[PDB]
Structures are given as structure tokens and as C-alpha cells.
């Protein structure tokens, strides 16, 4: 499965938001699990929806009030413990220059660069309301996605696959033009004339407009 790739899983292993926010009521993105019972007032942070709840019926609620990740109350949250940072960066360094896992999108059709820049744009808004001094809640907010973006952008495979996305030799599983082999030959010609630039435009917009805290 595309969500079980070691590079994607290595990128989305971040510290859970209860570890840097206690019983406070900061503004986050709130997910709901039908399977685990987080239904009415029990909520979970975004890293919970990534690492937790991977095969569940987890969705995003639009009418989101403030919450504080009631994920450890109903299930065993796998994101309360952060590993060694230097070994994580060394593993990312070794996986970038030895495999070809960066050109494969996830189950939502997103490249690794788009996922990383969306994580950075979300965490810049979410992490500015951190006040320095049942699980432990005395750790810093996670800073890994900035360094991951800075390393992945220094590579002529990830930038090439991101910019040349939606072309002929690049298949997106959530696009209507990917599976056109059972149609009439004229419709195949009309669908193969064009190329896709939705995700590239989204990546450029998230890099320029939504990232107004860095230039690097």
C-alpha cells in the first residue's frame, strides 16, 4: 500500500499534540473516528489521523471548535513517544540517495513534497500558540518537516517528479485520466492531449502564499 512506504511513514511520525499542549484549548484541525468512539466531544490531532486510525473510518469535521486531543482516553495512542532525531535524519539521508520511493505518491494522490509543504504551512499556524513553561506534556513542538523540506528540495529526483507531475509518464491514482484504456480511441486521444497541473499549482500556492514565515 502507498501509505505503508518507509519514506512516507518516516516523514509522518511526529510528536502528538497532547505532548506540547495540556488541557488548553488551542486552535487545531479536528478529526473524528467512528471506529474508536471519538464522536461527540472526544477529538484527536492531525498526527493522530496520520499514524493512528490508518485503516479506520476517520474524517475531518468542518465545524471545529477548540479541543486538546482526547485520543489516549479511548485507545492506545502510538505517537506519545518521540525517537532519536539524529538517527531519523540519518535514515532520511540514506533513504533519499539509495531508493526510488520519493516518486511514488500516497493513497491521497499527494507527492512527498506537497505533503511536507502542507505540513509546514499547517504547523506554522498551529505552533505559534505554544506557551513555554495523564501523559507527559512537557516537550517542545516537533521541528522535523522544515529540515525534511530543506533536504528533499536538494535533490534532482524529488523536484523533477514534483514539477513533472501529471505528465504522460506519471500516473495519479485519483485522476480520471489515469484509467482510460477501456474507452473509444477518439476519447483516448482527447484525454491524452492534455496534461495535469492541479497539484503543481497547489504546491506552488502552498510554497508562496501559505508559507509567509521563511524564504529558505
Amino acid at each position: 500500500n502507498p501509505d505503508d512506504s518507509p519514506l512516507y511513514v518516516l516523514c509522518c511520525n511526529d510528536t502528538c499534540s497532547f505532548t506540547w499542549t495540556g488541557a488548553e484549548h488551542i486552535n487545531q484541525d479536528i478529526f473524528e473516528c467512528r471506529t474508536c468512539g471519538l464522536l461527540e466531544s472526544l477529538c484527536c490531532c492531525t498526527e493522530c489521523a496520520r499514524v493512528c486510525h490508518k485503516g479506520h473510518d476517520c474524517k475531518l469535521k468542518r465545524t471545529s471548535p477548540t479541543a486538546y486531543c482526547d485520543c489516549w482516553e479511548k485507545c492506545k495512542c502510538k505517537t506519545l513517544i518521540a525517537g532519536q532525531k539524529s538517527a531519523r535524519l540519518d535514515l532520511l539521508y540514506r533513504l533519499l540517495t539509495a531508493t526510488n520511493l520519493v516518486t511514488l505518491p500516497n493513497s491521497r494522490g499527494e507527492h512527498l513534497l506537497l505533503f511536507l509543504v502542507q505540513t509546514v504551512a499547517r504547523q506554522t499556524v498551529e505552533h505559534c500558540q505554544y506557551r513555554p513553561p495523564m501523559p507527559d506534556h512537557d516537550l517542545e513542538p516537533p521541528r522535523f518537516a522544515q529540515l525534511a523540506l530543506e533536504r528533499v528540495l536538494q535533490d534532482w529526483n524529488a523536484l523533477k517528479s514534483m514539477i513533472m507531475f501529471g505528465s504522460q509518464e506519471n500516473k495519479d491514482p485519483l485522476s480520471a485520466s489515469s484509467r482510460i484504456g477501456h474507452l473509444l480511441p477518439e476519447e483516448q486521444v482527447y484525454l491524452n492531449q492534455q496534461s495535469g497541473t492541479i497539484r503543481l499549482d497547489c504546491f506552488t500556492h502552498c510554497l508562496i502564499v501559505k508559507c509567509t514565515a521563511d524564504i529558505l
Binding site: 485522476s175 477518439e186 476519447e187 486521444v189 482527447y190 484525454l191 492534455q194 497541473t197
Partner: protein, 694 residues
């Protein structure tokens, strides 16, 4: 009543089309100048052969840039429409961005208010920049074809000029070729042997697809065009959405005594090649269909219009209905009839009175009176029509003066005549059936008797082909298609010497007896390696034209006794089915759009708004047999007309003050139903199901 750019642009384009039509009419008189102009007018100039060639070169030089402008715009519009049609069949219909979604209706967006102006322009600009470098995948293009009225006038004028210059066996047998009612101009028809019936003639497999707003493409298959790769612009399929790119291709493919005056013959040459209007019509088929759909009231009113010549159901049915009204009001001879509610005496009195009345017709009105029953309204004639239809279509016996007249060849709901050793009584019965259909067409009513496509095509005077056999018996049509497809195999005689079929057939019980030969000398000529097309065509014309020739001739003469040979011209089987039999099944949307909802109770339960919703939910949650019984309770007919103009009284539901004691009443002659207001939805449903059974 305000100033607009588009009104002035359309008016200037109309003036340009008028002048171009005058230029075409002037250029068309050159080969007959000395007979038509230099024989009657006392003042005329002398015209030579070289002056006509110089005039043709002058006119072909002075109509280049408007031609380039029109061709670029039409190519971009057709590319956008074809990409939309390609994306419609490859995406999820449940998504709101799909073309076949309820949110894409323009009338539904206006009624939902009771997006922003910046977002619409931003989406239009983003579609404009993405279309330049072919970067428009999985996005529906942003365009408005209704704002392109000035292009259509110039296109119509140039097609008028091109059309005016242009007009001034085994497998290749004319039995396996489609007629003009099933082909597309400038397009390649599908292969009748290598394509199954589910994607070649979908109307034969699904007869319920016939609607007054149904397209031709989803009823008779998808056409194809053989235009790809060729250096000229007209030989390449238009796939690019950009106006600049299409204009670039058009210009790049652009700049890449003597004989008597009778021998002058102009040829169309814009781009270095001969140009026919058929391939221009086939190149922009979707744009022409949408132009005929949205620009008929003004652009289609021009003389010599190509939209009127390519008109669909609504263009022809209006002309037929106004000619029927004119021929009905031309004369003042009435027809009277007395019948009784049974079968045998009803059909006997019908035959006797219809023989006594003109034993062409000039019937002005038809009056029907039921014996020992009251009523003199117009709905009595409709009740008589559905009664004689269900009496003729029923299968009990022949009521003296023996086989039943009609039978089903294998498709439910369609009938073909049974000869049954035809005497003078059966022929007179079929002539009476044809005259009944003729008076039903004349009096703007519906006769619920349904015939097959070839039976209608015999009456209209059209050639029956191999594709009409799919409307007769589809399964053995498919079996014979596989037999043709296996008859060209590499093994050849290996499959031929397996069953050893002959040139004699065993008929069924309704068609007659059995063991009847097709060709002379009978059974002693088996199937050769190459005789199979001949065997198929003789079998098809034997089962469709030889067995029931006399009943078909009798019905044709009966239809021609009332109707002349000037109204069935330019009619088709499908609009004949829609004009006589209506739409077939009963839908909710047209029945909603036909009603009026007269209010006379004066009661204000939340300003009604709930009884009507419960009523339409009851109709929408109702079985089709009960729907036909419901429509029989409205206007004494089991079917609805195809359009609003088939109702001489408008349909009307009229509310009453609330009284839970009586069933709703029907006034058939004015198409009115008086219903009392009730309280419970279940009470309303029970009362409706009790009222419709009568």
C-alpha cells in the same frame, strides 16, 4: 430594453449574412446569364468566360480573414465540447465537478439562491491560462456558447455559399447500409457485423430511451471520423482548446473567343483543396447540435437555414401540427359515431359506420356517443380511441364478419400484422385500422396501438434495410450477426460443414405453416462458402415484406385515404411513434410541468406547500400500471402527449374545501380533476388508489 454589445454584434452579423446571401445568389446566375438576364431585361452587360474566373478569384480573395476567424473559433469550441464529453464518461458522476451533475444546471443554480462574482472571473482566467499550453486535465472548461450568436450568422452564411457552389453484389449491397434516419453527415457509420447490439443500436435493446428531448447519438450509436495525422488543417481532428493555436494552424495551412458561359462551373477552394459542406458539418457536429438547440428562434429563422434543415423532433412536429390544423380547419364536414361499451358489437358497429362514411377525406370534427351512457365532450372520443385500441390488440377471437390480427415477434409492447389466409374481411379491417390512425393523427389525439419500426416505415414509404431487423427479433439478429462473423473465418468450410443449413425455413404458427423455400429450386442448394449475404437478405425480406405484403398495403391505403402525400414527407419512424403513441411510459417531471393547481378552497395550512409535496411524492412512489390508471382518470387516455401543444385543454388539478367523505371527481372534456383537501398523507394515498381503480 437596454444597450448591449451582443445585440449590436448579432445585428451586424445578420446584415453581413444578408449581403453574403445576395452575393451567392448573384454568383449563381453566371452559367445561365444569357437565358435569364440577357433575354428579358432591356439593359444588361456582356459577360465573358474570363470575367467569371476573375470574379471568382476576387470573391475567394475577399472572404479569407472572416473564414479564418470563424474556423478558429468553431475549432476551439468543438475541441472544448469534445473534451467535456470525453471527461464526462471517464469520471465519477457523484462528484459535484462532473458534467452530468444536478449542480451544473443553470436554472437550478438560480433557484438555489432563494458563487461570487470574483470567483467566476478568476476561474475563467485560470481556464484561459491553462488552455494555452495544453494543461487542462481533469478540469471542466469555462465557456458560454449562448454568447456566441454573432459567430453562428457568419457560419450560416459561409455554409450557404459553400452549399450553393457545391450544388451548382455481396457485402457492398444496398441492404446493409443505414438510411438518412440513422447516419450522420460527414461521419463514418459503425460496422454492422463487428459491433454487438448493445453498443450499435441501443434503441433496439432498450425501447424506453425514446424521449422528445433525446439525442440521436445515444439512440443509434457513436459515430467516428477518420481524420488524423495529412498536412492541411481540415484533415486533422481539432484537439487543442486555444484560439491562438487554432488560428496559427489555419494561417500556416493557408500560406503553406474562348469557352462559352454555359461551361463555367465554380469549385470551392479556400485552403488549396476542394471543400465539401458535408465534412464541415461533420467536423463541428456537437457545436451545430448546441447551436440548433439554443439559437432556433432568431438564427434559425433566416432563409435557407442549416439549423432548420438539421432540425430535431421539435422542428418537425410543430410544422406537422400546424399543417394538420390548417387542413382540419380547411373543410367543414363532420363525422358522427354511435358505439356501445363491449367488444363484438363495438367492433361491428365501428366497421359498419366507418365503411358507411366514405365507403382524400375532409373530416372536420369527430363526435362519438356511447349507447345507454351520457356524455358529449371531447374525452369521449379519447375513450373510444383507447377502447378500439385495446379491442384490436386483445387476443380472444375474430368477432364474425378468423385469426387474430396482430402478434408480437419477440419484443414486448410492439405488434406486427398476422395475414392468416387473408380474405376480404381482414383487408377491410386493416384499411379501417389505417383510417382510424389517420383520423387520430388529424384530430390531435393519441391511439394506444404500437407497431414495429418496419411497419411504420412501410406506411411512410421508406426502404427497409438490415438494421430494421433488430427491431423485429433481436436475438436471432445477433445469432445471424455471429454467423456472418464466423462465415469469414480462416477455417472456412470447417464450420460450414457442421450444421449444413439449406435455403428453406420453418415458419412459426403465427406467420403460417412451415418448410417454405427462399429461392427457386428449393432445398437442394446448401450453403456455399460465399452465398451467406444473399441467404441473410432473402430471409430478412421474406420475413419482413413477403408474408404480410397485403395487410401492409391495406394499412398504407387506409392511411392515405385521409392523409395526402405531402405531410408524411420528411417524417421518421420515431416522431411518428411520438406523435401517435405519445411518450410511452409516464414520467413525473412532464406531469409536474403540465399541471396548473387551481385553488378554490381558501384554506391556508402553511400556505399549502405540504399537500402538493405529499401528492407528488405519492405519484413518484407509484407503480407504472397505477400511473396509467391515474392518467386514464385525468383525460381518459393511458398515455401523455409529447409536448404542451398536444393538449387543446390544459391539464388542471383544482382543490376543494376539506371534506373527508367523497372520492375526487373528474371532468374529462376540460381535463380537470376536482380533489378535496385531506389531512393525512396515508389517507390521501388510500383515497387515490381507491379512486383510480373505479
Amino acid at each position: 430594453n437596454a444597450s448591449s454589445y451582443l445585440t449590436s454584434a448579432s445585428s451586424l452579423a445578420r446584415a453581413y449574412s444578408i449581403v453574403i446571401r445576395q452575393i451567392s445568389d448573384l454568383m449563381g446566375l453566371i452559367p445561365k446569364y444569357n437565358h435569364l438576364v440577357y433575354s428579358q431585361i432591356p439593359a444588361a452587360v456582356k459577360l465573358t468566360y474570363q470575367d467569371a474566373v476573375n470574379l471568382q478569384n476576387y470573391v475567394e480573395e475577399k472572404l479569407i480573414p472572416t473564414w479564418n476567424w470563424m474556423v478558429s473559433i468553431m475549432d476551439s469550441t468543438e475541441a472544448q465540447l469534445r473534451y467535456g464529453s470525453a471527461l464526462a464518461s471517464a469520471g465519477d458522476p457523484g462528484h459535484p465537478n462532473h458534467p452530468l451533475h444536478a449542480s451544473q444546471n443553470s436554472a437550478r443554480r438560480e433557484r438555489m439562491t432563494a458563487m461570487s462574482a470574483r470567483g467566476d472571473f478568476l476561474n475563467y482566467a485560470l481556464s484561459l491560462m491553462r488552455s494555452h499550453n495544453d494543461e487542462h486535465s481533469d478540469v471542466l472548461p469555462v465557456l458560454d456558447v449562448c454568447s456566441l450568436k454573432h459567430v453562428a450568422y457568419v457560419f450560416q452564411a459561409l455554409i450557404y455559399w459553400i452549399k450553393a457552389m457545391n450544388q451548382q453484389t455481396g457485402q457492398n449491397h444496398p441492404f446493409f447500409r443505414r438510411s438518412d434516419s440513422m447516419t450522420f453527415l460527414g461521419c463514418i457509420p459503425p460496422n454492422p457485423f463487428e459491433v454487438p447490439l448493445a453498443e450499435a443500436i441501443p434503441l433496439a435493446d432498450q425501447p424506453h430511451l425514446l424521449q422528445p428531448n433525446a439525442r440521436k447519438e445515444d439512440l443509434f450509436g457513436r459515430p467516428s471520423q477518420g481524420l488524423y495525422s495529412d498536412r492541411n488543417c481540415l484533415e486533422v481532428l481539432p484537439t487543442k482548446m486555444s484560439y491562438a493555436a487554432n488560428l496559427k494552424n489555419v494561417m500556416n495551412m493557408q500560406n503553406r473567343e474562348g469557352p462559352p458561359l454555359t461551361s463555367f462551373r465554380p469549385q470551392c477552394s479556400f485552403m488549396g483543396m476542394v471543400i465539401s459542406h458535408d465534412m464541415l458539418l461533420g467536423r463541428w457536429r456537437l457545436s451545430l447540435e448546441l447551436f440548433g438547440r439554443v439559437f432556433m428562434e432568431d438564427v434559425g429563422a433566416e432563409p435557407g437555414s442549416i439549423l432548420t434543415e438539421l432540425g430535431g423532433f421539435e422542428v418537425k412536429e410543430s410544422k406537422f401540427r400546424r399543417e394538420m390544423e390548417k387542413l382540419r380547419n380547411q373543410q367543414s364536414r363532420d363525422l358522427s359515431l354511435e358505439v356501445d361499451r363491449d367488444r363484438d358489437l363495438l367492433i361491428q358497429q365501428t366497421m359498419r359506420q366507418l365503411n358507411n362514411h366514405f365507403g382524400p377525406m375532409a373530416v372536420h370534427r369527430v363526435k362519438v356517443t356511447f349507447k345507454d351512457e351520457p356524455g358529449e365532450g371531447s374525452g369521449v372520443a379519447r375513450s373510444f380511441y383507447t377502447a378500439i385500441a385495446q379491442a384490436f390488440l386483445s387476443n380472444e377471437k375474430l368477432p364474425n364478419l378468423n385469426a387474430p390480427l396482430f402478434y408480437q415477434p419477440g419484443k414486448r409492447g410492439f405488434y406486427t400484422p398476422r395475414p392468416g389466409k387473408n380474405t376480404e374481411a381482414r383487408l377491410n379491417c386493416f384499411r379501417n385500422i389505417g383510417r382510424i390512425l389517420g383520423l387520430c393523427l388529424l384530430q390531435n389525439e393519441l391511439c394506444p396501438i404500437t407497431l414495429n419500426r418496419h411497419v411504420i416505415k412501410v406506411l411512410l414509404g421508406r426502404k427497409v434495410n438490415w438494421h430494421d431487423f433488430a427491431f423485429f427479433d433481436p436475438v436471432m439478429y445477433e445469432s445471424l450477426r455471429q454467423l456472418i462473423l464466423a462465415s469469414q473465418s480462416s477455417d472456412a468450410d470447417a464450420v460450414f460443414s457442421a450444421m449444413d443449413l439449406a435455403f428453406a425455413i420453418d415458419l412459426c404458427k403465427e406467420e403460417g405453416g412451415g418448410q417454405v423455400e427462399l429461392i427457386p429450386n428449393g432445398v437442394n442448394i446448401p450453403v456455399t462458402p460465399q452465398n451467406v449475404y444473399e441467404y441473410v437478405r432473402k430471409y430478412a425480406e421474406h420475413r419482413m415484406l413477403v408474408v404480410a405484403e397485403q395487410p401492409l398495403h391495406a394499412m398504407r391505403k387506409g392511411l392515405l385515404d385521409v392523409l395526402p402525400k405531402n405531410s408524411l414527407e420528411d417524417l421518421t419512424a420515431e416522431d411518428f411513434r411520438l406523435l401517435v403513441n405519445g411518450c410511452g411510459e409516464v414520467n413525473v417531471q412532464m406531469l409536474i410541468s403540465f399541471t396548473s393547481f387551481n385553488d378554490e378552497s381558501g384554506e391556508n395550512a402553511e400556505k399549502l406547500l405540504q399537500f402538493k409535496r405529499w401528492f407528488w411524492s405519492i405519484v413518484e412512489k407509484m407503480s407504472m400500471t397505477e400511473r396509467q390508471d391515474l392518467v386514464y382518470f385525468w383525460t381518459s387516455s393511458p398515455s401523455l402527449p409529447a409536448s404542451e401543444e398536444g393538449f387543446q385543454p390544459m391539464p388542471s388539478i383544482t382543490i376543494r374545501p376539506p371534506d373527508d367523505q367523497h372520492l375526487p371527481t373528474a371532468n374529462t372534456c376540460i381535463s380537470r380533476l376536482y380533489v378535496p383537501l385531506y389531512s393525512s398523507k396515508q389517507i390521501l394515498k388510500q383515497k387515490l388508489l381507491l379512486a383510480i381503480k373505479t
